[model samples]
Target: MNYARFITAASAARNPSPIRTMTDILSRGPKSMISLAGGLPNPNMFPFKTAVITVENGKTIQFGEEMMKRALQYSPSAGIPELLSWLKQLQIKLHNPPTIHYPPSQGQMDLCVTSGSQQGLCKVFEMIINPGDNVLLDEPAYSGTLQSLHPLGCNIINVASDESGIVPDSLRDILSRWKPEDAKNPQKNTPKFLYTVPNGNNPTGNSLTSERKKEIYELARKYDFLIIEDDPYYFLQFNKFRVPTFLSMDVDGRVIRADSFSKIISSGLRIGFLTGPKPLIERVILHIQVSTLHPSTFNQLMISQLLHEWGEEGFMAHVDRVIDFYSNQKDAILAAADKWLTGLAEWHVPAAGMFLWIKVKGINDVKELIEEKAVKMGVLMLPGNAFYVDSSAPSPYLRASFSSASPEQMDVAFQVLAQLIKESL
Candidate 1:
């Protein structure tokens, strides 16, 4: 028997992630290099000391050792019950009315814990998306979401968006035009899910307004589709003004909100939760059971203990500190852009999140630039196309992250990028 015969179908073969692939080229040595590539939180700002104390202190509490041990062992698929209760309080605080214990299996709203929101998204696609099922996504969206949806062989419908985030009118129009009759019998022409990063959206650095969110929520209801609110940066929202979430407005439980500790606590924690109807949540639990068994119990316990110890006010204060740190970094980057690239690059000063999405004038093929010129120039920036579903012809936009780079490094990086733009033009 030929060993080659054991290989999976053509579609089953693995394709590399565009963002991860770029890392190799980006890692090449360049003196005084500044990277604005990753959407990573600044390691300097992460509360690692707090995390250490929480773990050490938590181990002494009742059932603490047991919890930590269980964390290292296989645990329940629905997650630790105590942690779920704590999340319920958070939901209540966020104004999710008529709180429930667990999420439903189908179209039933509830919360499911995952290693990260990325895993939650994958589980969601697994539960709903059949081969060739139509699913909607923001054109320049989070790359992780796009990668998670890849294996399902689903028909991905890329929705157009503006600087304000996903355009409500465009989304409404797209849903209105999707006729069920045009699809194959037993096939749904309309999308089963629509994914959005309403608060501090990635790559674009824009947040959706409350009015726009209401409109999008109404559209989701009207079209009879569910929403995947992938909001890791929800807590990092820096604007004095905050908008209502799709989950808050979801009286019918149509929104599945995925929240993460990566942005707020630390990325290494690998803890996140998704909330929707009970039916959907049950399915998610089943998916977890088959996949990773359960998320790290120790991490969950540690986070919960931290929250319990900190209380709401304490957590909010700590979060505000993180926000302030990032806000200053953002200000530094924008100020540098003002001085260096003025007329050459245009961007919206993000009200929240860690990125500055810069659309450079006369630089369309950014991937090529990153692979060739930008890397050589000793500055690193993610090409706008990396976040999109179609990476072949991404916009001339470049995503610059201020969270990781020092203020001085950010300034120097922008200068290098500006020079590259001038040379390319």
Candidate 2:
């Protein structure tokens, strides 16, 4: 992959800070070597002492003085070495991305921890998008992504999706609209990348089939665009066999994948990781250098300790528990919707995630109904228009999160929504 062509001039211009570079060097240096670089503080000067956490199954993760001191200090822009190594191991176990095995000259894969997957997504977009650049977005996209890209001044081309996730025909049509020769033209405005949430999409709650993933990957190779696999809900799949990820299939080093703990772990922790071709990951690290510095060294250390205790099998078992919990939640919401919304609305049985995307039947737009009537009636779901690139456009869809609410609550909410839909008619 010719990464230089994709990186924005601003991103290309960014160089690592000397202090941060020295800090990174000192971190890896021998214990016998005395460090006289960077603003690293003495651990004894810190007020906080020992750190301990008790988790499920009576497991305790207590950081000794040595580990605690490491936690309190600044980590490299990518992440603390221990945590980064753990994440890399996890990625290899799960995806075994082809890029990871490639030689450095051939663009090997690299991983970096971010404040959250959202920040990583924002930084990657910032790194790639120049004003007026063309980008492809899956229609009814994540509203957060819409908001992030809106300020970048890029032309967002929406690709259609069905119950099966991103439609290949729609993407093919769009890419083929600009001839194959056009992709080679330096002056032409071909798309830089296609952004997708493959497993359990946010508002829609749909997972792409393996076939669709391969098709999309082929399209990316043919059209010469990168794939931004923003898969926060990958582990949340309700199926017995999980679908393969774009990253796993990325033989051409075209996929930049973001993984998040917000759904699985405590959202408050605010930690996630990005794995991709080295150059792009390097740019994101530089962005982190200027901003958050690193994703909370203390938080990273705590997570690392917990994972080290759990090991790979324990972590997978924990993820299975979360998947089962959300699967039940999905079932409860579906049952409620069926009980109350059979005739008044339509929805796909979500394959994964915690959302039910309802299309209110016969309503030209549900914005007024949700904002004014539904809220007054003690029922609420986001208006579908919010997910679109052009949010001002009318939409009959409503995004309902089934994560927290009990079955009884979902039942009443859907009943009230049905009543509101009838009233509108």
Candidate 3:
């Protein structure tokens, strides 16, 4: 399943800037060579001094002078050298990508850092999609995912999902029965690959078992499509039995896992990375070279410095704290829903991540009801339709967040929501 042939025309033609040539040689040349190469700013000229950042219960990162210099200056699109290496090792420990150590061009596996995991998703779509191409997604997709691919003219397809995330049987059926005439758009036959948020999914809050992951991977092999494993909340789990990622099970590089520190660390940094086939990552780096020219150099270096300060054990200690906080939040929101809306709505106890996706059983559509009714009552949630590929259709579900809302506020919000549903009925 080599996807290099699928590279878009724009990506296939990209070449490094001529300006990079002389400077690259100079940096790697003999120490005696004093010939001027490029007008690159000296990091010594950077104005930033030592800066302090405190997070997750008084853990302070005191960025010393040398570290701050790298933070303020430009760096590679792949990421800051030290941070990228740190994440590379972290990913190796977590997912165990196919080829352990080889360059992106010749190796079977590689990685690239982006401003955010969502940004990496955008680059993937841009590289693979041409008009009439089809992309499959788990039903009730993440809105950011939909918005990213919205204007790209791709024919979006949705596979039915269950409590364990994307269903293999359903996915196989759709691809097996796919016909050009049955497609939503003309000239579309079957999907390219599927997008899944397997850990505490966006609008569904469902997680896939390792057994389920293998089943889906087998289908991808049989159908000749790839998988995008977008698990930003991989660290925010409440369960003890951690399910393996698709990348872990993939033998030939079938999964591109997009990971983020947003949920575990801080979202404002907006730094994330990808691990997958080398060819795909190589193309994505070219896109990064042009788009934002790399994520914030300051953010990457700061994160690296912090990670160096906190080894594996310390990082997990911080993750445990974040998990404990979110778990309690989930409990509070669930208690609120039970006391106020037990019979009117239905939802499972989410295994991980931030939201409680509830279905208001009797409602034909929750969008207008929320806009005209729930908003006035002071309880807010995203309409199920907003997450759908075809938003014009009706949906019975709603995505409610428990992360930012307090226990007392959740109790009040659910009470308001329960009353609103009753009045509408």
lDDT of each: 0.72, 0.88, 0.81
lDDT accuracy of residue 70 in candidate 3:
65
lDDT for each residue of candidate 1 in 35-150, tens digit (9 for 90 to 100): 66753333344232222342432243333443434545444566777787778678778756443533343333467778887788777777777676787878787887777778
Q: Judging by lDDT against the true structure, name the best candidate.
A: 2
**TM-scores for the candidates:** 0.81, 0.96, 0.93
Rank by TM-score (best first): 2, 3, 1
lDDT of 2 at 377: 95
- Once fitted onto the true fold, the runs of candidate 1 whose alpha carbons sit more than 4 angstroms away are 1-73, 98-109, 179-188
lDDT of 3 by residue, 1-425 (tens): 55654578888887754236656778798988886767567888767788898755436887788878767877888887888888888888887866666544544777888998888888888887887788888878888899988888888878888778888888878888764334343344456678898899987778888888888888876766778899888997789557888877777666788998899876888898888888888888887887788889888877787787788778878888889999999999999989998689999888889999999978889987788888887778888987888889999888999889989999888888888888888
Which should have the higher lDDT, number 1 or number 2? 2
TM-score of 2: 0.96
